[PDB]
Amino acid sequence: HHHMQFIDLGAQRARIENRLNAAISKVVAEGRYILGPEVAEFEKKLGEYLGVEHVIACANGTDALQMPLMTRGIGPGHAVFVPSFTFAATAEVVALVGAEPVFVDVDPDSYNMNVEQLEAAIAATIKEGRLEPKAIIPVDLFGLAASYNRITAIAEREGLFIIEDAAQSIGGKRDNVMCGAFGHVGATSFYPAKPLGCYGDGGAMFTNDAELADTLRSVLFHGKGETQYDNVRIGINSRLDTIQAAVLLEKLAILEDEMEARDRIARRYNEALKDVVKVPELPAGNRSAWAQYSIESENRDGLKAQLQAEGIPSVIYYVKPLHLQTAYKHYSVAPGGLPVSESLPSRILSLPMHPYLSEADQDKIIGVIRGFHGKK
Amino acid sequence: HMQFIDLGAQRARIENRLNAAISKVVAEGRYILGPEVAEFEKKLGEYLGVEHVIACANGTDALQMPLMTRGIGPGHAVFVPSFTFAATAEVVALVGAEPVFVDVDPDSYNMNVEQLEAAIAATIKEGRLEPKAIIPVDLFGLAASYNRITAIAEREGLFIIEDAAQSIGGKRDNVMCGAFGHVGATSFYPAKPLGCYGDGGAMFTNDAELADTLRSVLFHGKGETQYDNVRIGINSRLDTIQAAVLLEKLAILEDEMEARDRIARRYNEALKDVVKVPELPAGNRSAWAQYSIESENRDGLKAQLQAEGIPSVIYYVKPLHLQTAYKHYSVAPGGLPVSESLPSRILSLPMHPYLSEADQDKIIGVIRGFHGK
Ligand SMILES: Cc1ncc(COP(=O)(O)O)c(C=O)c1O
Numbered sequence: 001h002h003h004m005q006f007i008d009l010g011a012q013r014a015r016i017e018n019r020l021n022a023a024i025s026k027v028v029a030e031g032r033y034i035l036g037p038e039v040a041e042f043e044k045k046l047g048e049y050l051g052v053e054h055v056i057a058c059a060n061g062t063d064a065l066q067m068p069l070m071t072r073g074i075g076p077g078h079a080v081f082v083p084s085f086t087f088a089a090t091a092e093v094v095a096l097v098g099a100e101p102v103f104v105d106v107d108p109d110s111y112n113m114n115v116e117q118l119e120a121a122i123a124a125t126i127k128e129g130r131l132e133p134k135a136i137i138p139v140d141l142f143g144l145a146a147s148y149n150r151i152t153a154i155a156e157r158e159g160l161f162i163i164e165d166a167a168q169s170i171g172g173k174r175d176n177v178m179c180g181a182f183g184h185v186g187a188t189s190f191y192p193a194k195p196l197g198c199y200g201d202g203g204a205m206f207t208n209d210a211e212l213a214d215t216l217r218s219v220l221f222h223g224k225g226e227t228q229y230d231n232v233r234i235g236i237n238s239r240l241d242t243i244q245a246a247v248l249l250e251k252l253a254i255l256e257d258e259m260e261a262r263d264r265i266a267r268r269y270n271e272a273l274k275d276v277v278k279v280p281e282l283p284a285g286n287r288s289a290w291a292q293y294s295i296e297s298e299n300r301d302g303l304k305a306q307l308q309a310e311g312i313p314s315v316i317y318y319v320k321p322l323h324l325q326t327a328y329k330h331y332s333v334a335p336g337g338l339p340v341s342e343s344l345p346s347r348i349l350s351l352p353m354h355p356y357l358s359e360a361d362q363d364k365i366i367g368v369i370r371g372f373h374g375k376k
Numbered sequence: 377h378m379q380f381i382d383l384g385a386q387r388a389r390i391e392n393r394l395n396a397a398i399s400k401v402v403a404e405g406r407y408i409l410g411p412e413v414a415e416f417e418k419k420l421g422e423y424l425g426v427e428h429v430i431a432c433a434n435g436t437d438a439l440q441m442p443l444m445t446r447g448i449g450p451g452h453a454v455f456v457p458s459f460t461f462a463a464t465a466e467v468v469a470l471v472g473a474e475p476v477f478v479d480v481d482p483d484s485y486n487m488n489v490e491q492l493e494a495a496i497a498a499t500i501k502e503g504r505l506e507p508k509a510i511i512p513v514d515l516f517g518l519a520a521s522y523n524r525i526t527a528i529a530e531r532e533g534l535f536i537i538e539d540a541a542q543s544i545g546g547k548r549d550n551v552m553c554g555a556f557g558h559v560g561a562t563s564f565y566p567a568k569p570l571g572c573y574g575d576g577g578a579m580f581t582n583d584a585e586l587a588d589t590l591r592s593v594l595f596h597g598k599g600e601t602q603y604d605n606v607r608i609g610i611n612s613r614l615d616t617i618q619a620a621v622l623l624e625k626l627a628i629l630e631d632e633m634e635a636r637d638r639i640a641r642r643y644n645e646a647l648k649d650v651v652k653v654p655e656l657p658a659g660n661r662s663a664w665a666q667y668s669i670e671s672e673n674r675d676g677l678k679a680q681l682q683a684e685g686i687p688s689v690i691y692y693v694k695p696l697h698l699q700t701a702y703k704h705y706s707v708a709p710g711g712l713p714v715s716e717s718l719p720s721r722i723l724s725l726p727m728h729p730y731l732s733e734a735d736q737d738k739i740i741g742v743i744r745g746f747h748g749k
């Protein structure tokens with residue numbers, strides 16, 4: 001018997017099984033469970049991969065977005081511009097620090113923050129005069145880099161801080177700049193299903209600013225000052241475990257080949273499916289991390305059921321955009337509302353997508369989708 | 377070179393069990409909230425005699441989340457020790473409330489109960505902040521004075537979060553540390569009496585509603601469904617791999633607590649007359665996260681121990697109310713002279729369940745020698 005996985009961690013582990021065992025056993029034996037050598041080693045190796053001078057490992061990708069807001073003093077009285085079509089963390093951290101998220105729609109093709117509407121949202125916030133614009137958190141949704149040149153042009157006028165939410169986009173790139181290396185600071189997650197993932201919770205932050213890096217390293221260890229005995233700011237506890245850094249070192253050594261595989265797999269879906277469903281085209285000069293391979297379909301509920309009847313898993317990202325969820329629905333939304341974010345949940349679907357998807361399994365998936373849409 | 381807290385000797389004792397447990401998790405691939413997490417919540421719950429255990433990412437988060445559930449924030453006061461690890465006060469600041477620092481007893485090093493009453497009354501009398509909560513710490517594994525604190529909180533309508541970061545395994549009158557107050561919190565930082573091999577934590581309560589709300593907060597404020605968050609939360613989970621480690625640690629904890637009791641009593645009896653020793657009050661078992669004495673010329677003592685290959689550590693060098701980050705917050709009437717003088721004389725010695733008679737004798741010999749005996 002054979003079967004397919006949505007994101008196949010087992011196939012990946014099989015590839016590097018004994019290397020993972022050794023890396024884990026070394027940490028277990030050495031007894032340096034907190035900030036042991038593998039942590040700094042991973043920060044360095046990931047830094048060179050991404051071309052960023054500073055990598056600050058931490059506990060998870062939510063923490064990774066919160067800490068930069070804390071270092072900038074963002075909090076009560078302050079507005080942070082975020083997509084609604086994203087994972088809750090992007091907006092939640094803004095509320096957690098006492099600031100308000102302001103929700104911006106996404107582009108109907110890239111699923112990433114709409115730049116024109118961002119500009120309008122900032123202008124409306126200034127006109128209302130109740131909050132001060134402080135930051136923008138674009139998301140590289142599904143692995144595809146957001147439009148950082150136009151977003152930064154807006155930030156330049158307004159003095160705003162940009163945090164790249166690269167939770168889903170490690171391995172992605174746009175005109176030879178790696179995802180992670182945009183904005184003032186980048187953030188990611190090593191949640192196990194991400195393109196670069198560990199075997200527990202983990203995260204990191206990225207920046208070329210040495211001062212910002214020093215502040216982040218303070219914040220993640222209770223706001224430690226220049227000495228071991230005096231905390232100079234409010235912080236948190238947000239460390240990447242040595243044991244998870246050891247896992248990540250082995251994941252990182254195969255990430256680039258896996259990115260080639262993902263690109264190959266995505267292109268094969270796009271060429272085979274473009275006439276029956278809406279496919280995620282890769283714009284010139286981009287590589288996506290393909291955290292998800294997301295299509296839009298007529299009768300999407302019908303399609304998903306037929307895929308499951310044929311033993312094919314699929315997932316809807318996202319069922320409820322943030323601005324419609326109870327916790328965030330009272331926060332302000334950009335002028336014009338969020339029609340794209342509101343309508344995508346009725347038609348979007350993510351398909352199995354990982355480096356180990358076989359030709360045969362992909363063919364089967366293609367066949368079911370084409371068949372559903374009346375192709376013989 | 378002698379270990380301060382010997383995780384190596386502990387690991388050797390359960391080496392194969394740890395390896396099997398870790399192997400199992402690695403192969404199963406349920407790395408987030410895998411079965412070992414719930415298994416561990418159940419077993420720890422049985423050990424502590426609480427109805428609900430909510431595992432989480434670390435002992436700091438474990439203090440923060442209950443404050444969030446209570447809506448504690450701007451305009452509110454939470455009463456805490458200055459003589460403790462930063463997290464105890466930090467989380468109060470982090471939610472927007474203010475810590476109000478209370479001094480500690482010069483023998484137990486735990487929150488002074490009379491001065492807590494003074495502090496609550498004074499904050500009410502002042503009228504700038506509303507009293508919401510108290511976070512006593514079971515410092516070094518010794519339970520705080522919960523009968524008195526609980527009665528005060530009931531009278532004043534305040535919420536008690538027990539900071540049991542250092543006290544799992546400790547008991548007071550047949551009540552387990554972690555089971556006091558409205559909710560308890562702990563750390564599984566590797567050096568704690570119950571520790572994992574990374575960061576981890578947990579919260580404890582008998583209130584089913586609070587437990588459900590805490591399970592929501594630690595996963596971004598999840599509502600009754602998968603797709604609609606109803607409150608602001610965080611990401612605070614205990615990894616499956618660490619739960620697996622913790623199950624093995626828990627299975628030898630009671631024996632280790634007996635060993636720690638034996639080791640500390642032998643220290644107290646042999647050092648009684650040369651230094652101030654941490655006496656165990658009747659009806660208590662301490663978790664002995666640390667074994668803390670006070671000595672004349674403590675700096676000389678520490679250097680002498682170190683010259684003889686024996687590590688020791690000063691907990692704490694700078695009380696929180698003097699630290700830059702917290703120095704602007706209010707202090708209880710009378711000030712905190714105990715918290716301000718302890719750093720000149722306190723010192724913690726090697727303490728763990730595997731301390732050999734030979735190592736302990738050496739340590740004892742050096743301290744007694746230093747003081748002329
Ligand atoms: C876009 C985005 N941002 C932030 C996060 C939060 O990361 P973590 O899951 O490590 O808390 C996620 C989670 O995967 C995500 O998809």
Ligand SMILES: Cc1ncc(COP(=O)(O)O)c(C=O)c1O
Pocket residue numbers: 237434435436437460461463464513539541542562563564565575576577
């Ligand atoms: C008394 C006390 N409370 C809270 C904490 C925070 O726990 P964690 O280190 O798991 O963040 C510590 C850490 O040792 C502690 O000693």
Ligand SMILES: [Mg+2]
Pocket residue numbers: 059200201202241433574575576615
């Ligand atoms: Mg962790």
